[PDB]
Amino acid sequence: TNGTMMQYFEWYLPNDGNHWNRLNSDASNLKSKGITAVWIPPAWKGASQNDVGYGAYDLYDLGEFNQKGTVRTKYGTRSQLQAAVTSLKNNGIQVYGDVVMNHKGGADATEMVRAVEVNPNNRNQEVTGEYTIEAWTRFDFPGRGNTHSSFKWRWYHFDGVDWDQSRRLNNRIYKFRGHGKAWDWEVDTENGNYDYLMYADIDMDHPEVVNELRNWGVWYTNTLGLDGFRIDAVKHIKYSFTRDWINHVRSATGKNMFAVAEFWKNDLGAIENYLQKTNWNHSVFDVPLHYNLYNASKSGGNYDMRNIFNGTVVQRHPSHAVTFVDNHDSQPEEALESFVEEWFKPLAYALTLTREQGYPSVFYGDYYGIPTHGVPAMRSKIDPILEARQKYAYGKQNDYLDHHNIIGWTREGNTAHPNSGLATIMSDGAGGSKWMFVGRNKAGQVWSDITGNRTGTVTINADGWGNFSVNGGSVSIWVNK
Numbered sequence: 001t002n003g004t005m006m007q008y009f010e011w012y013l014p015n016d017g018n019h020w021n022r023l024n025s026d027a028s029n030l031k032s033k034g035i036t037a038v039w040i041p042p043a044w045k046g047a048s049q050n051d052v053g054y055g056a057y058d059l060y061d062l063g064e065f066n067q068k069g070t071v072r073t074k075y076g077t078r079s080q081l082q083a084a085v086t087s088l089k090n091n092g093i094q095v096y097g098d099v100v101m102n103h104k105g106g107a108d109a110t111e112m113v114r115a116v117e118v119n120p121n122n123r124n125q126e127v128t129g130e131y132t133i134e135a136w137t138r139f140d141f142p143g144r145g146n147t148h149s150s151f152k153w154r155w156y157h158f159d160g161v162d163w164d165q166s167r168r169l170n171n172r173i174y175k176f177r178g179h180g181k182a183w184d185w186e187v188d189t190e191n192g193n194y195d196y197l198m199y200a201d202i203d204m205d206h207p208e209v210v211n212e213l214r215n216w217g218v219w220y221t222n223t224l225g226l227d228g229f230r231i232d233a234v235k236h237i238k239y240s241f242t243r244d245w246i247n248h249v250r251s252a253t254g255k256n257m258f259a260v261a262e263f264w265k266n267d268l269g270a271i272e273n274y275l276q277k278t279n280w281n282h283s284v285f286d287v288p289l290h291y292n293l294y295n296a297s298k299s300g301g302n303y304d305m306r307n308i309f310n311g312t313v314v315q316r317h318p319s320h321a322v323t324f325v326d327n328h329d330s331q332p333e334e335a336l337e338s339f340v341e342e343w344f345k346p347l348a349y350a351l352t353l354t355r356e357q358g359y360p361s362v363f364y365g366d367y368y369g370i371p372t373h374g375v376p377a378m379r380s381k382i383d384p385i386l387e388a389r390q391k392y393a394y395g396k397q398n399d400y401l402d403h404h405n406i407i408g409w410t411r412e413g414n415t416a417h418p419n420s421g422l423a424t425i426m427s428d429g430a431g432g433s434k435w436m437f438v439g440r441n442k443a444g445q446v447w448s449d450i451t452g453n454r455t456g457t458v459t460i461n462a463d464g465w466g467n468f469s470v471n472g473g474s475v476s477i478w479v480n481k
């Protein structure tokens with residue numbers, strides 16, 4: 001009940017290989033703050049040492065083999081990582097490992113491959129005849145040999161690439177030619193077929209590939225003792241594959257692994273399709289909510305706050321929604337930059353942390369800051385919201401998203417939690433107040449703002465109503481503390 005997930009990394013973390021240790025020694029602190037699950041960054045060897053991990057080179061090298069010019073990953077060695085997991089396990093925190101199965105970058109060598117170019121804006125249309133290119137599709141893993149796995153990757157294990165080493169032409173997408181070669185399906189339909197994204201695109205139609213990735217999922221789960229996954233770029237991956245992959249792993253390990261997929265599209269329709277196609281066997285990040293939050297932080301008070309939840313996954317399918325404010329892609333400078341402004345950030349964290357629907361997530365970047373880009377640590381403002389979730393956010397919810405600026409909602413609390421119950425009120429504009437029902441058994445109680453933004457108190461009247469207030473462009477969470 002009331003769990004809180006935390007993405008434990010940001011894109012511009014320093015390449016000092018001491019991240020696993022930071023996580024190791026921060027376990028006790030996080031669990032006390034209300035964090036119940038940590039989603040760790042790619043644990044495997046990328047195309048280089050300072051690769052964030054998405055340039056997935058070898059999924060069996062968790063900072064254990066000398067490859068790509070280093071033994072450790074950007075975050076550390078395999079032993080440091082496992083010492084980190086142990087620390088989290090001892091503090092009763094679950095561990096979610098990231099998962100990159102859409103592609104493989106940093107190949108060991110090139111191969112001559114027959115292929116055709118396709119239209120970047122419609123990968124279903126071949127724009128050239130068949131011809132030979134030089135693609136980075138060969139993986140032998142010199143530093144690992146056959147340790148853990150003997151599987152070797154070759155061009156026929158992929159559907160295509162975006163780079164021909166023999167000509168070095170820009171803005172090209174190459175679809176490989178051969179027996180049964182075609183972009184995968186089903187996948188997102190933007191650009192005709194969105195199977196191809198970057199690097200060497202893995203072919204989910206090849207049985208050896210499916211078999212291998214499933215086997216790796218199990219090895220990866222048992223090796224680290226993972227409690228779940230954060231699956232990368234699922235809109236570019238065959239939907240049925242991901243579904244059956246997750247099922248395979250849950251079955252082969254006897255664990256009901258939690259799974260949150262990143263279907264990055266600001267479209268609920270597309271996301272619902274993915275959910276239906278994957279038989280609802282796992283959750284998805286609420287990308288639309290993130291954009292609603294972002295757009296609101298950018299409207300200077302003119303966002304109609306009554307709609308903050310329109311078109312969002314948490315509103316339509318709350319059981320399958322992992323709600324977040326920001327991540328490594330939305331942070332400053334990144335490809336999908338859409339950073340929720342600082343002033344609005346705490347309102348955004350109250351919207352995800354104090355409501356009963358959705359599985360909330362805290363971003364490392366917002367919590368500890370992103371010094372390279374001037375983002376201050378906001379844990380001092382997030383901690384109060386975390387405590388409200390851990391101790392107060394329980395019981396029946398009564399919404400009050402009935403004003404273009406000032407919206408709010410209360411939680412009546414339940415006996416399972418001593419003194420539970422809260423009244424969240426926020427304004428993206430001018431301050432004010434709002435009468436809200438918190439429960440008749442609360443009559444006479446004297447409530448205070450756990451964020452400390454408002455210093456007074458609110459006395460619940462004999463009928464269960466309290467007249468709560470909030471400052472402009474701010475959030476207040478009144479509880480019976």
Ligand SMILES: OC[C@H]1O[C@H](O[C@H]2[C@H](O)[C@@H](O)[C@@H](O[C@H]3[C@H](O)[C@@H](O)[C@@H](O[C@H]4[C@H](O)[C@@H](O)[C@@H](O[C@H]5[C@H](O)[C@@H](O)[C@@H](O)O[C@@H]5CO)O[C@@H]4CO)O[C@@H]3CO)O[C@@H]2CO)[C@H](O)[C@@H](O)[C@@H]1O
Binds near residue numbers: 054108
């Ligand atoms: O430097 C010599 C190098 O040569 C060989 O490397 C080659 C690669 O193996 C080969 O795959 C190819 O790599 C290309 C890649 O195909 C191409 O897609 C591009 O990669 C970009 C993405 O396009 C871009 O979207 C971005 O992706 C990020 C994303 O922004 C972020 O949101 C998140 O999802 O993480 C993603 C991964 O970081 O960035 C990547 C990388 O900038 O460019 C690649 C080349 O830079 O071509 C390489 C040769 O040029 C050898 O294998 C290697 O050992 C040698 O070091």
Ligand SMILES: OC[C@H]1O[C@H](O[C@H]2[C@H](O)[C@@H](O)[C@@H](O[C@H]3[C@H](O)[C@@H](O)[C@@H](O)O[C@@H]3CO)O[C@@H]2CO)[C@H](O)[C@@H](O)[C@@H]1O
Binds near residue numbers: 002004005094319320
């Ligand atoms: O974090 C520890 C906890 O995580 C997992 O539970 C999460 C669910 O997987 C996830 O679906 C979500 O469930 C809540 C819904 O989102 C919400 O709309 C409402 O229906 O309440 C649900 C929970 O009561 O969030 C939970 C975490 O609260 C995992 O399954 C647990 O085993 C693990 O202990």
Ligand SMILES: OC[C@H]1O[C@H](O)[C@H](O)[C@@H](O)[C@@H]1O
Binds near residue numbers: 156178179
């Ligand atoms: O190039 C040799 C062989 O490579 C791969 O196995 C192809 O799938 C196959 O069609 C081809 O004959």
Ligand SMILES: OC[C@H]1O[C@H](O)[C@H](O)[C@@H](O)[C@@H]1O
Binds near residue numbers: 280316318319
């Ligand atoms: O388990 C299947 C069900 O999961 C969730 O409750 C969805 O909201 C619902 O649409 C779906 O039918």
Ligand SMILES: [Ca+2]
Binds near residue numbers: 159182205
């Ligand atoms: Ca294919």
Ligand SMILES: [Ca+2]
Binds near residue numbers: 194201202237
């Ligand atoms: Ca793909």
Ligand SMILES: [Ca+2]
Binds near residue numbers: 303
């Ligand atoms: Ca407004």
Ligand code: NA
Binds near residue numbers: 183184
């Ligand atoms: Na593919």
